[PDB]
Paper text:
Bacteria respond to transient living environments through transmembrane-integrated sensor histidine kinases (SKs), which act in concert with their intracellular cognate response regulators (RRs) to elicit necessary adaptive responses that are critical for their survival and virulence. The SKs and RRs have evolved into a two-component signal transduction system (TCS), whereby stimulation of the SK autophosphorylates at a conserved histidine residue to initiate a signaling cascade. The VicRK in S. mutans, which is an important pathogen in caries etiology, regulates acid production and tolerance conducive to dental caries, including proton expulsion (F1F0-ATPase). In addition, VicK has one HAMP domain and one PAS domain.
In this study, we report the crystal structure of the entire intracellular portion of VicK (aa 31–450), which comprises an SK dimer with one signal transducer, one signal sensor, and one intact kinase domain. VicK crystals diffracted slightly better than 3 Å; however, because of strong anisotropy, the final structure was refined up to only 3.3 Å. The overall structure of VicK comprises a dimer in the shape of a long slim rod. In addition, the HAMP, PAS, and DHp domains are organized as dimers, which are connected by long, straight coiled-coils of helices α2 and α6. The VicK HAMP domain appears to be a stable four-helix coiled-coil with classical knobs-into-holes interactions, wherein three pairs of hydrophobic residues from helix α2 form a central hydrophobic core with knobs-to-knobs packing, and it is unlikely that structural alternations of the HAMP domain play a central role in signal transmission. The VicK PAS domains form a unique dimer, which is mediated by a leucine-zipper. The dimeric architecture of these domains looks like a butterfly, wherein the DHp domain (aa 199–269) is a four-helix bundle of helices α6 and α7 with a phosphoryl receptor histidine located in the middle. Interestingly, the two monomers of the DHp domain bear an asymmetric fold. However, the upper parts of helices α6 and α7 are remarkably different, wherein helix α6 bends ∼25° at Pro222 toward the central DHp axis and α7 moves ∼11° away in the opposite direction to avoid a possible clash. Although the overall conformation of each CA domain in VicK is the same, their positions relative to the DHp domain show dramatic differences, which generates an asymmetrical ATPase dimer.
Numbering used by the authors:
A (entry chain A): 37 to 269, 275 to 304, 309 to 390, 398 to 432
B (entry chain B): 28 to 302, 309 to 390, 397 to 434
């Protein structure tokens, strides 16, 4: 009695410090025994309601945890308040790192919390939040935490990883840029031949070949197409050919092309007869492009010097020009794949370098303003 | 005699206690009690007096968390829904109720397999956890939706498997872009290849043993004109490419559009006539910042369109007026016109009613206009004929 109060007092002090405890036994039908019964029943009742509350809260945070896409939410201000695992991985971040931070702290792309809360925007970030060169492209869409009153609790962003789709896009973008750039010169050749030859179809002293080199060129352009597609969706072939003859074919093409008619001189600096195993087509591609920008960059007429010499390291072919070529800012990048697409406005010749490397060859360049550019190709 | 009093006070304190605690068991909070300072019933009364505040504090905090989470998971942009070992939808948020045109109520009467006879089971959906795609109405008017649903493995606080978690992403616009871009590259291919296989089939006749005897000049004509078509096409394609890579940006300079137009149209009457009716309207200073190069691209292209659309009577009317917020340029021709079904389609790349000859051109025009923050569209009756209208900011 005096004791039962000590005991029950104890039980309740336990319940206070969060420590649950078994029921006390109802001794008599006393009036406080009713109180003992009531405290028992309370400890149990609130126990259930508690385990239940935590059960559902947990179910929620569980869903958010094992969820596939990334989710984060912020106060009206915009400091991160919630950020799930997935979002953490996508953004290269821990909950720790994230909670002292603000959505605007995403690559500092200069948009405002109010722009955000007004427009509930659907936009796309790009970052290397993944250690090495590996990148990730994330599409983040926003929504409001609006309460019934209209009050905005904060922001709710979902981040889908679209880092692949981005790729497939730059691949096809790439294909278009390529096919448009690479068909140019063969197309201009076929033009020049059929064009000059639209007057001079007779002159069988030239016409039989004319038609044939133009035919071979449109056939080259088709095998070109298939290649360029498969590049984002290549293949090599080789035969032994007379290389001086090669350069004379290739160069005679350009020669003809310039004879009509707007507004540069190229001199063969080989000698006569060099035999080497290569792919006619793809080598023609390489030389074609190198000559392309060689002429492109050359001011006032043209100093374009094709000088090729042979040794025991075999073929060493050089193409020299005027104008400028430096700095070492552009120099190293001009051979990298996505250059032509991701640029800021050089030329191309990545595919050139690659057709050279597939020949187990080397291809470098030196160039200085008001001196010109020299490209060099080394074949086995 | 005040011993009786003491008994009274105590028992009444205990009764008061049973009041408070019985009212706790029912989940209702009542005011603190009066301490018998200093009885030992004071200690108990005060203990319950605190216990209440405890239950309440904990419950309010936990509640706040649970509700933060709850709001986040429903007001979030994507469809979310959870299930149990069965697959029966246990959870579904706003966005998902919308994407699926259902209600939490009628939705929870559903199991996850309940879609278009999907042909997948829970027992093989938990293993693969792999995402896939459904196209469904589930939305209002003339429109249909497409959902990318990524499945995920749900679990408890213990290792055990709770059920499934599906996120549904309304990705119809994305899907649309993707599709049309694909068709774009496909087009570039077919479109360049077929002139090639054409010119190749000709030159191949001009060598296989038919070289320059009977139809030669005509084969050189065909082949030449065709390779020039491929030339122009590849030029257009380069331009569009620059536009797609956001490299091709504008260069604007405040110009008198009325004069610009006269220059351009003189230039045009020129470059045209060798082997058509051009009618001018403006006649007054219309100062507007444009990129003369690009804008000339546009106008020249639309004029050429007008031409490719006429028998010989042309009748191209350039008519351009100015409201207080816009310059309205319009190029009208009494030609064939355009099917109302091709009408919303003609500015598409490599889209042609029937060619018959490009073939982008019109696309470039639209894109440049859009670059000026303007608009352009077609109208047609098939008689009289098609007319294109461009809208540009101010003057």
């Amino acid at each position: 009695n005096n004791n039962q109060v000590k005991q029950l007092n104890a039980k309740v002090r336990s319940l206070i410090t969060g420590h649950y405890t078994d029921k006390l036994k109802v001794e008599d039908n006393s009036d406080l025994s009713e109180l003992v019964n009531n405290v028992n029943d309370l400890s149990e009742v609130f126990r259930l309601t508690h385990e239940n509350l935590a059960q559902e809260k947990n179910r929620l945070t569980s869903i958010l945890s094992y969820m596939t896409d990334g989710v984060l939410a912020t106060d009206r201000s915009g400091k991160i308040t919630v950020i799930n695992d997935m979002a953490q991985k996508q953004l290269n971040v821990t909950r720790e790192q994230a909670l002292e931070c603000n959505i605007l702290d995403i690559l500092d792309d200069d948009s405002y919390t109010y722009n955000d809360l007004i427009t509930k925007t659907p936009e796309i970030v790009l970052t290397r939040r993944d250690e090495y060169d590996e990148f990730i492209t994330l599409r983040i869409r926003f929504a409001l935490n609006r309460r019934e009153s209209g009050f905005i609790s904060g922001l709710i962003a979902v981040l889908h990883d679209a880092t692949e789709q981005e790729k497939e896009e730059r691949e096809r973008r790439l294909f278009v840029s390529n096919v448009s750039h690479e068909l140019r010169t063969p197309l201009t050749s076929v033009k020049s031949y059929l064009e000059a030859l639209d007057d001079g179809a007779l002159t069988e002293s030239v016409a039989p070949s004319f038609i044939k080199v133009s035919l071979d060129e449109t056939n080259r352009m088709m095998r070109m197409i298939t290649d360029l597609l498969s590049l984002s969706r290549s293949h090599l072939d080789v035969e032994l050919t007379n290389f001086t003859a090669f350069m004379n074919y290739i160069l005679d093409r350009f020669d003809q092309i310039q004879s009509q008619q707007s507004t540069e001189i190229i001199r063969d600096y080989p000698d006569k007869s060099v035999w080497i195993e290569i792919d006619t087509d793809k080598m023609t591609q390489v030389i074609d492009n190198i000559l392309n920008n060689a002429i492109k960059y050359s001011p006032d007429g043209g100093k374009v010097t094709i000088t090729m010499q042979t040794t025991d390291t075999q073929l060493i072919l050089s193409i020299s020009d005027q104008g400028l070529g430096i700095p070492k800012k552009d120099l190293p990048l001009i051979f990298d794949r996505f250059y032509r697409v991701d640029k800021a406005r050089g030329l191309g010749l990545a595919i050139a370098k690659e057709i050279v490397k597939q020949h187990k060859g080397f291809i470098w360049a030196n160039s200085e303003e008001g001196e010109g550019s020299t490209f060099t190709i080394v074949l086995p």
